[PDB]
Paper text:
The functionally conserved MON1−CCZ1 (MC1) complex serves as a guanine nucleotide exchange factor (GEF) for the RAB GTPase RAB7A and is indispensable for directing RAB7A recruitment to autophagosome or lysosomal membranes. In metazoans, the MON1−CCZ1 (MC1) complexes have evolved through the incorporation of an additional non-tri-longin domain (non-TLD) subunit, RMC1 (Regulator of MON1−CCZ1) in humans and Bulli in Drosophila, suggesting functional specialization in higher eukaryotes.
To address these knowledge gaps, we present the high-resolution cryo-EM structure of the human MON1A−CCZ1−RAB7AN125I (HsMCR7N125I) complex at 2.85 Å resolution, capturing RAB7A in a nucleotide-free state stabilized through unprecedented interactions with CCZ1. Due to the RAB7AN125I (the nucleotide-free mutant) exhibiting poor solubility when expressed alone, we co-expressed HsRAB7AN125I with HsMC1 in Sf9 insect cells via dual baculovirus infection, enabling efficient complex assembly. The final structure demonstrated that HsMC1 adopts a heterodimeric architecture, with MON1A and CCZ1 each comprising three tandem LDs (LD1−LD3). Inter-subunit interactions within HsMC1 are mediated by β-sheet fusion between LD1 and LD3 domains of MON1A and CCZ1, forming two continuous β-sheets that stabilize the heterodimer. High-resolution density maps resolved key residues at the HsMC1−RAB7A interfaces, involving RAB7A’s nucleotide-sensitive regions: the Switch I (N30−D44), Switch II (A65−G80), and the P-loop (G15−T22). MON1A engages RAB7A through polar contacts between its E260/E290 side chains and RAB7A R79, as well as K263 and RAB7A D82. CCZ1 contributes complementary interactions via hydrogen bonds between E41/R60 and RAB7A R69, Q70 and RAB7A Q36, and E38 and RAB7A Q67/S17.
Residue numbers in the entry:
A (entry chain B): 241 to 652
B (entry chain A): 16 to 257, 278 to 286, 296 to 365, 372 to 396, 401 to 476
C (entry chain C): 7 to 126, 135 to 154, 160 to 178
Write the structure that this text describes.
Amino acid sequence: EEDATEAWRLHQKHVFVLSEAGKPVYSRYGSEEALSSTMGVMVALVSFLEADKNAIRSIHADGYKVVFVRRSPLVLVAVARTRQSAQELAQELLYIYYQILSLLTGAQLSHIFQQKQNYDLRRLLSGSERITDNLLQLMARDPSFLMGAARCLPLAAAVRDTVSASLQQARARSLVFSILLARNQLVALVRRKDQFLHPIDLHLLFNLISSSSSFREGEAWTPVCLPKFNAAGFFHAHISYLEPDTDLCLLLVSTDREDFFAVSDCRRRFQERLRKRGAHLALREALRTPYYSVAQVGIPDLRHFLYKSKSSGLFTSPEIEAPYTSEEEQERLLGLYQYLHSRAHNASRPLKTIYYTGPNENLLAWVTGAFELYMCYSPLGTKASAVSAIHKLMRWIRKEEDRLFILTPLTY
Amino acid sequence: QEKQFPPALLSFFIYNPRFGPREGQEENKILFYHPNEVEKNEKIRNVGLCEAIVQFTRTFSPSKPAKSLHTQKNRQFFNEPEENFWMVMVVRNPIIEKQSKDGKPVIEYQEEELLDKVYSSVLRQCYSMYKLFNGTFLKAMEDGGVKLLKERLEKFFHRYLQTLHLQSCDLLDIFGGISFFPLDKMTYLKIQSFINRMEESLNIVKYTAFLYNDQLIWSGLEQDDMRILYKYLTTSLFPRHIHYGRFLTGPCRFPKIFVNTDDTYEELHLIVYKAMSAAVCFMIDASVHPTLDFCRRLDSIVGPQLTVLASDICEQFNINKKEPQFKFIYFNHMNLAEKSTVHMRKSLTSVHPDLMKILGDINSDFTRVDEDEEIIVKAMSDYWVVGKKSDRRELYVILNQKNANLIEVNEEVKKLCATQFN
Amino acid sequence: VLLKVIILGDSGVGKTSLMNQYVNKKFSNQYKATIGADFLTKEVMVDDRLVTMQIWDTAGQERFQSLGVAFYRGADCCVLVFDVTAPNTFKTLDSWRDEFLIQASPRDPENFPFVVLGIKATKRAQAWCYSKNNIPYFETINVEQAFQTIARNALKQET
């Protein structure tokens, strides 16, 4: 017990979700019923300042931070020993909140917790914990959540337009979006007229498809809510894998529960369209190498970069290579990117250029009104080399732009 | 016409949770509380909130308790200068008074403006300021009980909190260094010879310190005690008064200070003497009580000798005296040396106030690493801000070079480092 | 099955007696002199089902009155500890329940489960409990029987 408690305290990020009455809803490490008293303490701390016409935000201690966010009827607490600020941790807790919303709908959540506040939300969230752990891991390693933008799978322009046209040709009345997915990467997105897709819903869909293997056994038909699109209603997503050996995931979002045969049609139709045009060989070739190396750019002393286009809302990044082979090093690099992004995107003190020269790496951030570019160099790289890398990578992205981005987003 | 309300000291209280263990004596926990006119129940409620915060953070890191609590309306900073003795400072968040569609005053609380390090350092400085003049809490306890402790706490902090201005607190308050007076070796040797001569001829004078132009020159005390003594001399003692040799503190009452508290706990009478701006501080053992004739004897002995020395520094300083585009703040941890070309004597900032938050955040990101580091940033206000941490030295440079790239900024930084820090 | 239980009375802070000798002694979380509530955990075995009690032993001081509307929300049941050495028994037992029903405001305050624990005449308290829709009365051992009956009720209502 003494050893178990000591190991529990040493985790780098505890996440607790609890109701406004104190009853546990979720704990990342440890059981919820063994942490019931501490969650009661959390609710008491929230209420103590709520009754003082105040609101508790965070508690900062040497080495760690407790962050409270209150999205009634829930209180979400994060005890993080990481570098993340209170704003980034609140963003992660809000991502957890939107993950719970994607399962319950905000209307149902508020109604069930205003009819009674002694309700145990774990009853509705039973079996959905692993989604929360997968989402937290994705935050830990996926640059999309920090970027708030989608990553496009590098694919030839002819092939990309062919598969996009195949996606568009297979449509139904109830469909709102058509998404083609490869390892949390976008291949082709077809949306309805004047129906934008928020990045947060796309990240929640990433986490939904990447959390379970039941989607690999055939066709899936599950109700999923898009909180940033419509928080008071349930969509219905048809999730399929085109070929057993591939990682191609097709997501078809619809407004109708009854319409499943039609969506299964619009999946089979798109598949046979792709087979007829012969683009499936090219797609398989692209899947065999679904990332590109830094060495393709040609500038030495570069290790990784992120480039997001503000106009399109899409970002590109090369494969994570040495020395970030291990999960710890990938997490550290993502944390460096998080620091750069948070500093350059301060609400009151925004910045347009950041250059960090640490003993382990060099970090660069160039943020304009059109794009944001984050770069990693070896510590031996100089400043003039950094600027030359900026210019060479800008040229290379403006040359590979057709292959790396969806330039002509289709529409039904 | 938006209205800006700066941060203000909402409240300040010192308590001890070990006092009043049984019910009904929670009021005994609160050793000191400001404002005093606040209701007793509210005082107990605030103290209990702080105790609960610390006891809750002890469930994730028993060795490291809470240092801060952020709320919508205020930020509360905790400190435990002595075991079980907790000071808490509650500071109001900055306020924007927006005019809505039909006026409708909207009170937005800007929760991200305050820098935690500034007010944490201010709280630590409050404790050390108390301890310089009244010693530790435990010593006063073993002397005269909770009653005596409370009288000492009130008598110091009632007058100390009046002089606290939290709107002007900035990075220099985080630093807590000493603004030294640069000099050559010959004048340094002259200073040492003079200090030895007077502290040996006067016998009972056991400690000494020499400052010029409000800047410290030579310090015979310990670093962490001379720090607070220099803050007292510069920000409290000199402004109240701002051969020509003149007594500045004394006539015979001399303030009693406590230095080397962690090792010897020495109580000394403090004596300050001025010739021009050449301040000389003598520190005498508490057993010896100076008389009117002693200071009269003291006046004669120091007298023209300090005046002769004082007229010597001014000539050399004037002799040593294009425009430096760099405006920097430099802090050295070996000697607590502090230099600043940004802040001038108003001391408040002389640059656009939106860049001090950037300068404070660079400091915030610095201390996570104990190695060489450099952060170069360009604000949306086309200002360049660099920060370098190397071998226990921190340098913050601000430049107005809106038409400049990274290479020119680095060249300017290197030129500054080569010239101003040769 | 997790239940939120409020104990009204027990001015003990550290020596709550009942809420110190109940069960476990781990998951202590003692903030009855700083927050106004004690947060304890107690596992209860009832009818092939194991329920957990998130017990809120709330302090009865006057500076914690404004926190009742917040600390009492979502409560499934409330336990009253009543001193048998008071002259205002019948006038202060009803006040506690009335203020609880005003602040907590459950969906069915009339049928809210209550339990009275006599601490340290029994006829008066028993008559009050009978006149208050047959509230179980236990004389305080006997701290275990109440919680099982507390578990017995409030499971009948929802479950």
